[PDB]
Amino acid sequence: NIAKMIDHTLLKPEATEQQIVQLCTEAKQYGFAAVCVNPTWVKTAARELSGTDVRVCTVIGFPLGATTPETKAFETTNAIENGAREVDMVINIGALKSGQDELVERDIRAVVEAAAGRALVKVIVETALLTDEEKVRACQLAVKAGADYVKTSTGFSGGGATVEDVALMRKTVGDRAGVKASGGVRDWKTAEAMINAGATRIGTSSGVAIVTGGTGRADY
Amino acid sequence: NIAKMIDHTLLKPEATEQQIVQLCTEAKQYGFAAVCVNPTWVKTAARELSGTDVRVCTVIGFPLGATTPETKAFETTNAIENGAREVDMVINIGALKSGQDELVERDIRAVVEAAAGRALVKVIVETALLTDEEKVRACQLAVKAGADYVKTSTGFSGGGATVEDVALMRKTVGDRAGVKASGGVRDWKTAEAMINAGATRIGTSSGVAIVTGGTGRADY
Structure with a gap:
């Protein structure tokens, strides 16, 4: 499962x-x-997944998070029109570093309001660039702006998911949002460790190797 | 100069x-x-530079180039509204690698048409990920779509300007577009080699060290 x-x-x-x-x-x-x-691939993926239970998820303002809330909102609406039913946005990291929490929250809210409930919204905090205090504050702002999930990492920065970060984000959001572990989750043992620390979604390119418990084909 | x-x-x-x-x-x-x-910083930069001949440039669909043409066009219009007067877009690399040349061209064109004379358009081809045939094709498409510059690299995906690539792009666009050498150009000797190879603009984080030859503030 x-x-x-x-x-x-x-x-x-x-x-x-x-x-x-x-x-x-x-x-x-x-x-x-x-x-x-x-x-760019949302429409394509939706065409391949039509009539199945596999959802199309895309990424917003990704991976740097340094575009405007208006652009992230447009990209979210566009993606939903093209077939996406979940979006993973990147937080405005520089704003969060600059202390501009109002902008961080407004940026997340721009994506959430653009989705208007038509797509699940996950907020990538990019744990590798944050202190623990910043991870906590990012999660709180994400929940305050009506996001559905917090997510550790883009896979395009200096580090991926850790069990410590997963647990910290879970403790912060409680039952108000999901936690997606991403970056460096390449095998079933790591996936299970993240699920045990509190993750309810795993972002990975190694999902086949994970689900077969390593006893699949092309598990190399 | x-x-x-x-x-x-x-x-x-x-x-x-x-x-x-x-x-x-x-x-x-x-x-x-x-x-x-x-x-996200365009407005700030435009406030700080207004009244000088230093232009505000921003980046479009950056660094991956893998969003839709409509989003790239909105982000360009939004950036110009916030004060930008040049935009450096990332080409749709994956569509090029898939041979979808009509989409690569339409993607560049959406940005050119969104700018509509209000901003210069540079097209990052991301030479590190391309074959030589792809470099040439990308520059030809950039010129066909009406762009003002072609640019070597984002600095985020694996390789930067080379004299060979700058020369090839200059040969390809000739006099119809500028060539911006970017990525790994952080000293004056390298900038010289790129200009000698045909570059007319230099993207760099180390402009002070380049223009002063080394006598600039905190050159370490």
């Missing part, structure tokens, strides 16, 4: 349509909760 | 308002062509 916790992810900039289609094929074969792709 | 060829750049996701104000202060001091900052 861990398959329904896996966001099967391909986000490298050089990814081609062939690779996206194979990603979707694997998600259908294994019953993953979602594929996670960049916005 | 090497100063007026330098786009003085700060794009790290954790960059703070104080760091952006500092960047602008430096660019005014040395009279660089532009600062290049993420869209």
Whole structure:
């Protein structure tokens, strides 16, 4: 049942349509909760996943989080129109570092209001760049702006999920939001460690190796 | 005048308002062509630079280039509304690698048309991820779509300007577009080699060290 916790992810900039289609094929074969792709591929992924229970998730303001709330909102509306039913946005890290919590919250709220309930919203805090205090504050702002999940990492910075960060974010949001562990979750042991620390979704490119417990094909 | 060829750049996701104000202060001091900052900082930069001949440049669909043309166009219009007067967009790398040349062109065109004379348009082809054939094709598409510059690299995905790449892009666009060498250009000798190879603009975080040859403040 861990398959329904896996966001099967391909986000490298050089990814081609062939690779996206194979990603979707694997998600259908294994019953993953979602594929996670960049916005350019949303329509494509929706076409491959139509009539299945696999959802299309994309990323917003990703990976740097340094665009305007208006652009993130537009990208969210656009993605939903193109077929996405979950979005993972990146927080405005620089605003959070600059103490501009009002802007951090307004930026998250811009994405949430753009979704207007049509898509689940996850907020990537980018744990590798934050202090523990900043991780906590980012989660609180995310819940305050009506987000559905907090997520550890983009996979494009200096570090990924840790069990310590997962547990801290879980303790902060309580039962008010989910926690997605992402970055460095490449095997079933790590996935289980993150689930035990409090994660309810796993963002990964190794979902096949995770769900087969290592006894699958191409587990290398 | 090497100063007026330098786009003085700060794009790290954790960059703070104080760091952006500092960047602008430096660019005014040395009279660089532009600062290049993420869209969230455009208004700030435009406030700090207004009344000088230092332009505000920002980055579009950056660094991955994997959002939709409609989003890239909105982000361009939004940036110009916030004060930007040049935009450096990232090409849709994955569509190029998939051979979807009509989409690569339409994507560049949406940004050109959104700018509609209000902002210069540079197209980052991201040479590190491309074959030579792809570099040439990308520059030809950038010129066909009406862009003003082609640019080597984002600095975020694996490789930067080379004299060979700058020369190839200059050969390809000839006199119809500028060539901006970016990524790993942080000393004057390298900037010289890039200009010698055909570059007309330099993207760099180290503009002070380049223009002063080494006598600049805190060159370490």
